[PDB]
């Protein structure tokens, strides 16, 4: 069955770095896009970034652009969000998701979420 599992969340100092992983099962991430979405207290859901793992093409929201990068290891079937220069506002639950049927099914599979706390 199709699943995404995130890991890497935890407590990190302001200005520090963290890497989140998003491991896929039951489909190949290089057949789709992987998105990251975060839920900061009081700010609903915010789209953060996406990657097309075939060629590593990326897009970033203005809020994280220039600080966060996405990568993917297609052999491990895993995407990564590399977070740099972390600030208070980056405190959130981070989700990964796939763009099912290259967007026809919107975000049809979601990870369980991992909390990042900038302290």
């Amino acid at each position: 069955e199709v699943q995404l599992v995130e890991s890497g969340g935890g407590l990190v100092q302001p200005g520090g770095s963290l890497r989140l992983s998003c491991a896929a099962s039951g489909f190949n991430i290089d057949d789709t896009y992987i998105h990251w979405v975060r839920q900061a207290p009081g700010k609903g859901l915010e789209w953060v970034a996406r990657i097309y793992p075939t060629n590593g093409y990326t897009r970033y929201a203005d809020s994280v652009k220039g600080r966060f990068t996405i990568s993917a290891d297609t052999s491990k079937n895993t995407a990564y969000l590399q977070m740099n220069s972390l600030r208070a506002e980056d405190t959130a639950v981070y989700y990964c998701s796939r763009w099912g049927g290259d967007g026809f099914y919107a975000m049809d599979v979601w990870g369980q979420g991992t909390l990042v706390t900038v302290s």
């Binding site: 609903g44 859901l45 996406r50 919107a106 975000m107 049809d108 979601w110």
Partner: protein
């Protein structure tokens, strides 16, 4: 770029009530609007894609509708487990943008 305006921000209702949430896009998005349910402690879950298609598995009391740039989610008979925050999203162009969310309390 595309702003999604969701209303209301929160509402309260009883088990068995019909509730409707509205989403307005700042530009044409064709049919491409999704609705997600997020229960406290849980990941968002897709309910509706392309304004009115029910994601396979999702209870049929959830339905989506579209009138031009106006989109609605209806829950026809609220169940205890439907207490959640609901979000609309356009999946027309990048970046995918979300409504502010509507918190539904029982």
């Amino acid at each position: 770029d595309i702003q999604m305006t969701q209303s209301p921000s929160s509402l309260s209702a009883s088990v068995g009530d019909r509730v409707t949430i509205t989403c307005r896009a700042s530009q044409d998005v064709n049919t491409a609007v999704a609705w997600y349910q997020q229960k406290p402690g849980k990941a968002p879950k897709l309910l509706i894609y392309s304004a009115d298609f029910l994601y396979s598995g999702v209870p049929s009391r959830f339905s989506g509708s579209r009138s031009g740039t106006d989109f609605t989610l209806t829950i026809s008979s609220l169940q205890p487990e439907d207490f959640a925050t609901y979000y609309c999203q356009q999946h027309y162009t990048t970046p995918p943008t979300f409504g502010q969310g509507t918190k539904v309390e029982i």
